[PDB]
Ligand binder design. Structure first.
Ligand SMILES: CCCCCC(=O)c1c(O)c(-c2ccc(O)cc2)c[nH]c1=O
Lengths: 281, 297
């Protein structure tokens, strides 16, 4: 398999690094013959894994998951590590973190949050039914197309630990919880924190040292929204996502049936406003 | 050419290679504009708000002279962009790669016992210089220890005093890689607040010596989240093999005292027989020189 992946030369070229580090070596690439854009993840190969591809092949075809196109291996000196290119759907509008970052008052209107949270839960549902936990839901992994469509990137379940602010309490080992549990509901916690991140512009504990946030998440009560302006429905949704003990955290299906997620008599108008916002920048 | 301000790099430093590997802390080859000499330049795109954070911590920097075992930090620069600017951190160029590269390009990924003592000593000497000047290096590891073609051993310093490459940019929120971390830097049940100390560098140096001996630090074989949990709760890690000398084991035991309050200083560790007594010093220096030559073909 791996040994049958062609050189990308003449097929995809790299344009530039996107996300300025949040994803590692992920480039905006273009399909040479057509000029269509693609995001390309570039890794030195030394690690039959090689199974990241099989995941992306089976599980990316859902509309809320960025589509896997294909893989290439670039011939490198005697002499030097070969590079593997993973080529994915390009999501032009960018991350939902960036959206809130660029909005005035670093906050999104509540029905934008309902729309987006639902899209994330839909992508997550697709992964969970196929027994896959994303394990790193956060606004930086939730992407937007020009079409104002919502797509999850960067899943699977390495040597560096990323940002801790969206991690569920249970996935953080401690004296009482020695073997740090990843359960599909962990993603639901992360989704709730992503909802707070959309409402306030940053996750709870954003002002802590990452290490101190890691210490605190399992020891703290569930985070709550700072302002009081939000609807009872949103408070309740956030509350559902952030059930401290995952054993009583609602399932993905249940949260999708939560009133805040289910009753959206503004989808059409909301989807148009996001379109409007994306273009205005 | 001052370390106490951030200026336009125009006429002082410039890049020699194209920036196509990213601008979030990637290092590129560069040039002192007046002299023509080589320079390693770390490049980071930076928001205006991060530029202010930058000025603040530039004031936080402490003064320390050049040293044979520290790749000289030359200062901090910002280059503007179509009115996100770039942060540049400039450092002495070391052509012959890192110690991680040294172990990787070695038969069976294991340095022999006298190479270890020599490199470890060089690391320790550079640290002593940092420590007498009240600065903690904070990231001692194989990858952060460099070789020149003269086989000189030098620590990476992109402004370690105020951690400029660490505090700014899209991944400054990342926990990082846990394996070289001293127990006291990890927040846990008995350690609610990370306490960085000079002696934290010495734990990392002990983990670095195991990295030279085995090609990888302890706990390499498990999820970094799990290793992070384990470092404060495990007894001090040890060398796997029994081949190593009684002096090497003792040195590893010297560095890897779990309670930093009772770990030796850098000076005390410089006097450790494994570091102090190097009969074959001259011989390994050339052995290293040899290795670097062969590797570039
Ligand atoms: C123009 C600004 C939009 C950036 C697009 C972007 O960041 C994109 C990605 O980072 C990824 C992405 C792909 C694989 C991965 O492991 C992590 C991220 C996919 N598609 C994108 O579109």
């Amino acid at each position: 398999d791996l040994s049958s992946l062609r050189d990308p030369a003449g097929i995809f070229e790299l344009v530039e690094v996107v996300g300025n580090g949040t994803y590692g070596q992920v480039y905006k690439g273009r399909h040479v013959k057509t000029g269509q854009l693609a995001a390309i993840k570039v890794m030195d190969v030394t690690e039959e894994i090689k199974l990241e591809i099989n995941m992306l092949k089976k599980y990316s075809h859902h509309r809320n998951i960025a589509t896997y196109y294909g893989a290439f291996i670039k011939k490198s000196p005697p002499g030097h590590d070969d590079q593997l290119w993973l080529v994915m759907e390009f999501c032009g509008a960018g991350s939902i973190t960036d959206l809130v970052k660029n909005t005035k008052g670093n906050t999104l209107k509540e029905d934008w949050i309902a729309y987006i949270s639902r899209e994330i839960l839909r992508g997550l549902a697709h992964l969970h039914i196929h027994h896959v936990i994303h394990r790193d839901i956060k606004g930086q992994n939730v992407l937007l197309t020009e079409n104002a469509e919502v797509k999850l990137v960067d899943f699977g379940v390495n040597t560096f630990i990323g940002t801790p602010y969206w991690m569920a309490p249970e996935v953080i080992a401690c004296d009482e919880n020695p073997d740090a549990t990843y359960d599909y509901r962990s993603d639901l916690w992360s989704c709730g924190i992503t909802a707070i991140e959309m409402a306030e512009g940053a996750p709870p504990l954003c002002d802590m040292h990452p290490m101190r946030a890691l210490f605190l998440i399992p020891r703290n009560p569930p985070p709550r929204l700072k302002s009081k302006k939000w609807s009872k429905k949103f408070f309740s949704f956030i509350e559902g996502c952030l059930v401290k003990n995952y054993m009583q955290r609602p399932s993905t299906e249940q949260l999708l049936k939560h009133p805040f997620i289910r009753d959206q008599p503004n989808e059409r108008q909301v989807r148009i406003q996001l379109k409007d916002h994306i273009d205005r920048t």
